[PDB]
Design a protein around this nucleic acid. Structure first.
Ligand code: CA
Ligand code: CA
Ligand code: CA
Ligand code: CA
Lengths: 163, 163
DNA sequence: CAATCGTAGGAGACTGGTCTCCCTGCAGAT
DNA sequence: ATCTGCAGGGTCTGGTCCAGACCTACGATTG
C-alpha cells in the first residue's frame, strides 16, 4: 500500500502514502542560481536524491508524476524549466528504485471532479484536506496547492475516493 | 584521475577517460514515444542509469556536461527538450555519485581553438580523432559529432592538449 | 513572508562591452 | 541508413479526427 505522488514544478512537492494510512508531503527542494546575470529558482538535485534515499518507501513503489504540458502561449523559459524539472525528477525517481508513471493533470482532476473549477488551486487544497485531514494544517495557505497536488496524485494512485 | 564528458542531447554521448589513457564513448540511449499524434525521440532514463552504474570511474569522478543554452530563435519544443535532456542527465550523474560540472560550449571550443569555424561538427570530429586515434573508426561519420563532443568535453576536463 | 497581477521573456565567457554558442523537428534525396 | 535542408512548432484523454480540457516561469507591486 505504498504510493508516491510528485508535482515536479518549482512550487511543487512529493507525497508519500504508507499502508497504514499515514502520509508525508515535502516541498520540492530548490536553490537560487545565477542565469544571465539574474537569480532564478532551480530544483536542488542533490537534496531531492537525498530525500528519495531517506524514504521508507520500498524499491519498486510506484511514483505518479504530473507530466509537463506547457501552453504554446507560455514563454520559452517556461518550456525549458518545465522540461528540466520533469527530467530531473524522472531520473531521480528511477535511480532511487521507483517505478515511474506519468499522469496528465486532466486525468487526476477528472477523477476528483475538479475540472472546469473557477478556483482550481483552492479546490485542490480542499480535496487534499478531506482525503488527508491530518495534513489540514499543512494546506492552509494558497501557496500550498503544490502540496495538495502531490497528495491528490498519490491518492489517485492509491485508488482513494472522496466521501 | 577519471573524467567523464557528456553531450546531453539526443544525438549526444557520454565519454569516459581512465587515468591510464584508454577512452570509452557511448551514444546516448533513447526511445521513440508518442507525443501529440507523432513519434519523438526521448532519452532512455533506465538505460542511462544502467550505463552509469556499469562505469568503473569511482564516486567523486568529475563529470563535465555541456550546458544547455538554446538560441532565443529556437522553438519552444527545442527549449523543452534541451531542458529535459539536461535535467535527466544531471540527476542521473548525481545519483550515480559523480561530481557534476557544467561547461559552456564556448569554454571547451576556445580551449581547443575551434571557435568561429565554418564546419564546427567536422572540426570536432577531426580534433577528437587526433586526441583519441583509436576512436577513429567511431568518428568517421558526420552524425558522429556527439561522440566527438563528449570526447572533447572529457579531454577538456583532463587537461589534454592538441599537438 | 504571502498574495496578486501580467506576460511569455537567451545565455555565456573574458566596473560594462563584445562576441560567442547551440538545439529540435520534420521533409526530401540518395 | 546517412545526409542535407529549413523553421522554430502544444499536448492530453477519450469518445478513425477532434472536442475540450490542462498548465508553467518570471518578474512586478502590495501588504
Ligand atoms: Ca500542476
Ligand atoms: Ca504546481
Ligand atoms: Ca553540443
Ligand atoms: Ca550534440
Amino acid at each position: 500500500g505504498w504510493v508516491i505522488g510528485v508535482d515536479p514544478d518549482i512550487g511543487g512537492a512529493i507525497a508519500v502514502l504508507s499502508p497504514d494510512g499515514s502520509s508525508q508531503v515535502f516541498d520540492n527542494p530548490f536553490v537560487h542560481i545565477v542565469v544571465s546575470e539574474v537569480i532564478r529558482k532551480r530544483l536542488d538535485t542533490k537534496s531531492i536524491i537525498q530525500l528519495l534515499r531517506g524514504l521508507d518507501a520500498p524499491p519498486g513503489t510506484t511514483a505518479y508524476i504530473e507530466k509537463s504540458s506547457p501552453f504554446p502561449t507560455d514563454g520559452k523559459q517556461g518550456w525549458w524549466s518545465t522540461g528540466f524539472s520533469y527530467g530531473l525528477w524522472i531520473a531521480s525517481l528511477v535511480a532511487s528504485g521507483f517505478s515511474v508513471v506519468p499522469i496528465a493533470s486532466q486525468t487526476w482532476k477528472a477523477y476528483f471532479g475538479l475540472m472546469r473549477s473557477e478556483t482550481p488551486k483552492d479546490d485542490s487544497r480542499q480535496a487534499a484536506s478531506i482525503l488527508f485531514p491530518d495534513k489540514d494544517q499543512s494546506l492552509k495557505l494558497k501557496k500550498h496547492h503544490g502540496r495538495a497536488e502531490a497528495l491528490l496524485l498519490a491518492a489517485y494512485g492509491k485508488g482513494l475516493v472522496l466521501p
